[PDB]
């Protein structure tokens, strides 16, 4: 967890994670567990109902880096969603599902809840996000105390 190793870990393209996009939903707050717990269920349900029509979630791969969270389509590699760190307000895992998590994107009054179904556990992704957020906060304080101590 050395600031130096952690900075190397999120540098550039950062960490990659194979997953599927459950869905994107418009919410009202920038945070809250119940609110962000409910929205997950609403999205999984839309997905569940779609299975009857031979629907499938879009296979994607996502990156966690200083650019925030990016979602790339697995087939064409095209970047479909880029959510900068300062636009992300809340991270929340799914209690009844260890392979799914979500987060809220957007500026005040225009939030969105993104739901993801990871190939492996969602634990490592939540952890990386946590550390990346904390890191940036620290680097921002220190690199501010310095400029203001000029």
């Amino acid at each position: 967890r050395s600031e130096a190793t952690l900075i190397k870990r999120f540098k550039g393209e950062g960490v990659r994670y194979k997953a599927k996009l459950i869905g994107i939903d418009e919410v009202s707050a920038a945070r809250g567990d119940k609110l962000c717990q409910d929205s997950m269920m609403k999205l999984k349900g839309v997905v569940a109902g779609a299975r009857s029509k031979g629907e499938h979630k879009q296979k994607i791969f996502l990156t966690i880096s200083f650019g925030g969270i990016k979602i790339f389509d697995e087939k064409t590699g095209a970047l479909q969603h880029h959510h900068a760190v300062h636009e992300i307000s809340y991270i929340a895992k799914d209690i009844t599902d260890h392979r799914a998590f979500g987060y809220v994107c957007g500026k005040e009054g225009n939030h969105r809840f993104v739901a993801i179904k990871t190939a492996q556990a969602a634990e490592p992704v939540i952890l990386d996000l946590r550390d990346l957020f904390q890191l940036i906060y620290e680097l921002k304080q220190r690199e501010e105390l310095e400029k203001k101590a000029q």
Partner: peptide, 9 residues
């Protein structure tokens, strides 16, 4: 539990 981003905004 969930985690809020300290640098949000």
């Amino acid at each position: 539990n969930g985690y809020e981003n300290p640098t949000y905004k």
